Amino acid sequence: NATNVKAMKYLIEHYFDNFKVDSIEIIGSGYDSVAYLVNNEYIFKTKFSTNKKKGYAKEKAIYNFLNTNLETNVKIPNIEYSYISDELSILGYKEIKGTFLTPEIYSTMSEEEQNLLKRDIASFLRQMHGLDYTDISECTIDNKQNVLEEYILLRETIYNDLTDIEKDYIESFMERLNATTVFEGKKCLCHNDFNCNHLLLDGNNRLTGIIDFGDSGIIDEYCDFIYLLEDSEEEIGTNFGEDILRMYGNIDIEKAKEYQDIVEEYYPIETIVYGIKNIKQEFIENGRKEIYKRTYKD
């Protein structure tokens, strides 16, 4: 543990001239990033070379755009330190204080506390989704087209070595992708990883902060409801997302659920593709296995 922290202490002090690290600890870990709490006050997110060679650049541009244009009491990261290069990216900002939303916390809230939280979320999303996004217009994301390009990569690499069951799962997904209309609706700036782990509560269980806009972009409006609609141990439940969708208004709830269901079906394939692109066999294997688990559940 001690070594990462020393290297990152050194890099922070090298790239940010008058910054002094008096303490530093690991506060979280993606698959190709690490986040550090520094001086009990700053979050420093860091990444070395990956497939998204313009990744902390876009995230920074999004924080800048949102801090300029949103009118909200909800806090988001405000970037004070940045170093962006092919081989290394670092973003630093003051830690937003609060407690992450969890199923457990939610279930201790009164009905009225739950409603206020859902209203806060709906309000935040209505405001972000309504922003004129001309100034960040390079941050477009076309999920349907990305899937098509990922399927072509599969065809060019490992598809022919897959089993029939794996191939059928993929083709069956592609058929559904080609029949769906859920990519043809409203586009807007979305957080795009909007789940419990990114939502902070204050001491009254109201929404006080939102973090990790690392996958944000201009994309289908439905994107931001996918995790709020998820029925799993890590998320609150389908009821929660439905109620939020009703409060948000002016959105087709059945298509939001179809969008969620298609992204969920894609997940094993997304996992395999991640493995191909980043030369990690473990992910290719996990995705293929997941296909068998899903095929045999019913």
User: What is the set of active-site residues?
Assistant: 193
Residue 212 annotated as lining a ligand binding site: yes
Closest CB 160 distance from Cl ion, rounded Å: 13
Q: Which of residues 193-252 bind Mg ion (CB under 5 A)?
A: 212, 214
Phi, psi torsion values for 212, nearest 5 degrees: 55, 75
Q: How far is CA 29 from its chain centroid?
A: 14
* 59 contacts Mg ion (rule: CB under 5 A): no
* 284 contacts Cl ion (rule: CB under 5 A): yes
Residue type, 28: G
CB atoms within 10 A of CB 203: 9
Q: For residue 131, which of 205, 216, 60, 50 has the smallest C-alpha distance?
A: 216
Q: With contacts defined by CB under 6 A, how many residues of the chain interact with ligand GNP?
A: 16
40: left (phi over 0), alpha (psi -120 to 50) or beta: left
Closest CB 70 distance from ligand GNP, rounded Å: 16
Closest CB 141 distance from Mg ion, rounded Å: 14
Pairing of strands 24-29, 42-48: unpaired
Residue 284 binding target from Cl ion, ligand GNP, Mg ion, none, CB below 5 to 8 Å by type: Cl ion
Longest Cα–Cα distance of the chain, Å, equals 60
237: left (phi over 0), alpha (psi -120 to 50) or beta: left
Q: Which of 88, 96, 116, 218 binds ligand GNP (CB under 6 A)?
A: 96
Q: Which of residues 173-212 bind ligand GNP (CB under 6 A)?
A: 197, 200, 211-212
Q: In this chain, which stretch among 25-33, 122-130, 231-239, 277-285 interacts with Cl ion, using CB under 5 A?
A: 277-285
Q: Which long-range contacts (CB under 8 A, 24 or more apart) does 137-141 make?
A: 137/218, 138/58, 138/61, 139/58, 139/61, 139/62, 139/189, 139/216, 139/217, 139/218, 140/187, 140/217, 140/218, 140/219, 141/192, 141/217, 141/218, 141/219
Q: Which of 6, 23, 30, 53 binds ligand GNP (CB under 6 A)?
A: 30
d(CA 249, CA 119): 11
Q: Which of 45, 187, 255, 288 binds ligand GNP (CB under 6 A)?
A: 45
* 272 contacts Cl ion (rule: CB under 5 A): no
Q: Which of 11, 15, 16, 28 binds ligand GNP (CB under 6 A)?
A: 28
Q: For the CA atoms of the chain, what is the radius of gyration?
A: 20
Closest CB 274 distance from ligand GNP, rounded Å: 12
Residue 231 CA: distances (Å) to CA of 22, 196, 240: 42, 12, 10
Of 43 and 291, nearer to ligand GNP (C-beta) is 43
Residue 95 binding target from ligand GNP, Mg ion, Cl ion, none, CB below 5 to 8 Å by type: ligand GNP
Q: Is 132 helix (H, G, I), strand (E, B) or coil?
A: coil
Site string for ligand GNP, 100-139 (x = CB under 6 A): ----------------------------------------
* 291 contacts Cl ion (rule: CB under 5 A): no
Of 142 and 270, nearer to Cl ion (C-beta) is 270
Residue 285 binding target from ligand GNP, Cl ion, Mg ion, none, CB below 5 to 8 Å by type: Cl ion
What is the enclosing helix (H) or strand (E) of 174? helix 164-179
Residues binding ligand GNP (CB under 6 A): 27-28, 30, 33, 35, 43, 45, 47, 77, 95-96, 197, 200, 211-212, 214
